From TrEMBL, chain C:
It comes from the Viruses. The gene is ORF40. It comes from Human herpesvirus 3. This is Major capsid protein. The chain holds residues 387 to 434 of 1396 of the full protein.
TrEMBL record, chains D, G:
The chain holds residues 98 to 145 of 1396 of the full protein. This is Major capsid protein. It comes from Human herpesvirus 3. It comes from the Viruses. The lineage of its organism: Viruses, Duplodnaviria, Heunggongvirae, Peploviricota, Herviviricetes.
């Protein structure tokens, strides 16, 4: 595997500004303007409740009636990523 | 922010198509992947 | 245009053709939106 | 002689270009392509 | 008749061929771009 | 052909190009695995 | 010889005309400016 390298250099002799860019037209939107709430149970560090059943039922109820939720086994020392669903319909969902 | 030039110069220099803050592969708009180099223009972010 | 002789180029066939390199000038723009949800105008003169 | 071609084929050669960049991305290598296009056969009949 | 009748199987619908050809940044797209292009295709084919 | 359905059904769903089955399906939603056309056809553990 | 440059520079100066006005305003004096810019390096790579 030969590799071919060539160094180059540039400079702008501009006493002011010399180039201008402007967003002329708009193509298809990428993200989706859906209704996806934000789940705050993806973070750790706060002062928890004194009863574990309380927070467990709380997280269960919060997962009920939503789309993105932490995986149930709750892996300690992880990233707490949601379960990967199947294909997407009309674009990447945006949180609220 | 630090004061080096006037507010007009700082404002004209801020809008320079800063790096993105999301992902273009996932469907949940995760955090920005460390190392992903893509520049998106961000208006109404420097104006708050 | 105006009073100048500017070039007008649309490089998409002489370059960036049959290649895996993404054509530039297709950058993105981040826009935010805000909406109220449960506001109730507490005014008899406004509830009409 | 077309009633004896018994699944012939034809082909030619064209290659795609590429560009050269640098940075936090792998180097680029020229790629050549080789393709063959098969031959379909149909008949024509007219009675008398 | 053999010609002009063979080409109908090679010709795809314009309503689909146009935006596909228009959106050619790199050939293969990610899921997000694919879904956006699909919404475009549906909007186009429902109208033209 | 007639299909049964609950009485209090969202009427706004029938105001656009809809799907008669009640849930969107097809092979157009993929990207990683071939065993997903069966995933999004009956699996009711994940949303539509 | 681009391989060995080690921070090449470029420099240019500019002058500014003044206008003779009198009254309550204090007197003026001609002013000169001196600016220097650096060069920017970048490589290019390909494979074989």
């Amino acid at each position: 595997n030969f590799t071919l390298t060539q160094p180059r250099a540039h400079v702008d002799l501009g006493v002011g500004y010399t180039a201008v860019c402007a967003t002329a037209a708009l193509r298809c939107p990428l993200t989706d303007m859906g209704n996806t709430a934000q789940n705050l149970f993806f973070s750790r560090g706060g002062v928890p409740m004194l009863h574990d059943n309380v927070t467990e039922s709380l997280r269960r109820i919060t997962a009920s009636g939503g789309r993105l939720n932490p995986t149930e086994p709750l892996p300690i020392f992880g990233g707490l990523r949601p379960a990967t669903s199947a294909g997407i319909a009309r674009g990447q969902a945006s949180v609220c | 922010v630090n004061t080096n030039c006037n507010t007009l110069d700082r404002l004209l220099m801020e809008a320079k198509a800063v790096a993105s803050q999301s992902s273009t592969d996932t469907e949940y708009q995760f955090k920005r992947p460390p190392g992903s180099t893509e520049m998106t223009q961000d208006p109404c972010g420097l104006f708050q | 245009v105006g009073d100048k002789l500017v070039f007008l180029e649309a490089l998409e066939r002489r370059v960036y053709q049959a290649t895996r390199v993404a054509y530039p000038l297709i950058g993105n723009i981040d826009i935010t939106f805000i909406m109220p949800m449960g506001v109730f105008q507490a005014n008899s003169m406004d509830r009409y | 002689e077309l009633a004896y071609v018994r699944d012939g084929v034809i082909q030619f050669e064209v290659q795609q270009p590429m560009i050269a960049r640098d940075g936090p991305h792998p180097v680029d290598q020229p790629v050549h392509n080789y393709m063959v296009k098969r031959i379909h056969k149909r008949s024509l009949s007219a009675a008398f | 008749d053999q010609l002009l009748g063979v080409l109908l199987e090679k010709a795809p619908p314009l309503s689909l061929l146009s935006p596909i050809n228009k959106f050619q940044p790199e050939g293969h797209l990610n899921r997000v771009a694919r879904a956006a292009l699909l919404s475009d295709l549906k909007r186009r084919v429902c109208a033209d | 052909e007639f299909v049964a359905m609950p009485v209090s059904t969202d009427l706004q769903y029938f105001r656009t190009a809809c799907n008669p089955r009640g849930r969107a399906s097809g092979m157009l939603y993929m990207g990683d695995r071939d065993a997903d056309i069966e995933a999004i056809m009956f699996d009711h553990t994940q949303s539509d």
